């Protein structure tokens, strides 16, 4: 292995729930676990493509300090409750959706018009607060797909959480093969937003990196 | 990095000798680096003397 050592064999990953998980790797080489963990973190953070909500055109005052008007849902309140909803587009571009119903107050993610391409990971996700009347209003929001994530202040709008990621970090552990214990094995604990299998995320990230490994030396193989 | 010193200690010691040594040693190592770069470039002996 010309100091090629080996690759962590055991890849056991423990998921406490669908939104939180932890993964452990077998012995990787000294520094190799740490360098690889940092690289994977920088990639999965600096690049996590996906679909999410971008901007809305709600009826009423366009000022940030607007009035709920009996809806009891502040503009920021509804904006945060919706910007966290993982509305995913199947294969299309940005998809705009609008909703209008009575004054029940119960904000679920199933109230809007169900588009074929647009899908939401949580159909009961709250988008706003309970109202105090029986009126209707139009949201006129759009859901877009993008690589990584984008700021919303510069891109006018609420929060561009195209990355469906919540928590992830790389821990480093040590172990011996027989007696040589200076082995850098990386450990990853990651709590995820959802709509993405963590194994699927790892495989996709590895595939993207390998496709880029085809740059320069192009991960040259040999006999 | 080569040797990392825990910064929290030095103010308690009230010994700038660490800081003075750092500055002076940086100066000496840099001058030696310039001299070695000149030698690798094989600069003029009179120029190096100047």
């Amino acid at each position: 292995s010309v100091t090629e050592f080996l690759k962590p064999r055991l890849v056991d990953i423990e998921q406490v729930s669908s939104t939180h998980a932890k993964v452990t790797l077998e012995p990787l080489e000294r520094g190799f676990g740490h360098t690889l963990g940092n690289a994977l973190r920088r990639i999965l953070l600096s690049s996590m493509p996906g679909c999410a909500v971008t901007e809305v055109e709600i009826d009423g005052v366009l000022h940030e300090y607007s009035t709920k008007e009996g809806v009891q849902e502040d503009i920021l309140e509804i904006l945060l409750n919706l910007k966290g909803l993982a509305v995913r587009v199947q294969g299309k571009d940005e998809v705009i959706l609008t909703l209008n119903k009575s004054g029940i107050g119960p904000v679920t993610a199933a109230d809007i018009t169900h588009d074929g391409d647009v899908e939401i990971v949580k159909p009961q996700h709250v988008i706003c607060h309970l109202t105090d009347e029986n009126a209707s209003i139009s949201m006129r929001i759009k859901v877009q797909r993008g690589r990584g994530y984008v700021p919303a202040s510069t891109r006018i709008l609420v929060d561009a959480c195209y990355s469906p990621v919540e928590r992830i970090a790389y821990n480093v552990e040590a172990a011996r093969v027989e007696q040589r214990t200076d082995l850098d094995k990386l450990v990853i604990e990651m709590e995820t937003n959802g709509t993405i299998d963590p194994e699927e995320a790892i495989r996709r990230a590895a595939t993207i990196l390998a496709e880029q490994l085809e740059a320069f030396v192009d991960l040259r193989d040999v006999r | 990095v080569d040797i990392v010193l825990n910064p929290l200690g030095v103010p308690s010691r009230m010994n700038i000798g660490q800081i003075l040594e750092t500055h002076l040693g940086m100066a000496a190592k840099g001058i030696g680096d310039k001299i070695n770069a000149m030698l690798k470039q094989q600069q003029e002996v009179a120029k190096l003397r100047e």
């Binding site: 940092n38 | 800081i19 040594e21 750092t22 500055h23 002076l24 940086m26 100066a27 840099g30 310039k34």
Partner: protein
């Protein structure tokens, strides 16, 4: 001040302050650090005998 001027002459920061890129994540650490060639010595007591 002569030390600062010498650092400037040696293409070194006069106060020596200099930023760095991390070795574990490459992150540029804040507080651009002043450093240099600082000496260290050994003690008559040694690890193995103890």
């Amino acid at each position: 001040a002569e030390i600062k001027e010498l650092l400037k002459l040696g293409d070194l920061p006069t106060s020596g302050q200099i930023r760095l890129y991390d070795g574990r994540t490459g992150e540029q650490f804040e507080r651009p650090v002043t450093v240099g060639y600082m000496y260290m010595l050994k003690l008559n007591h040694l690890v193995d005998d103890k």
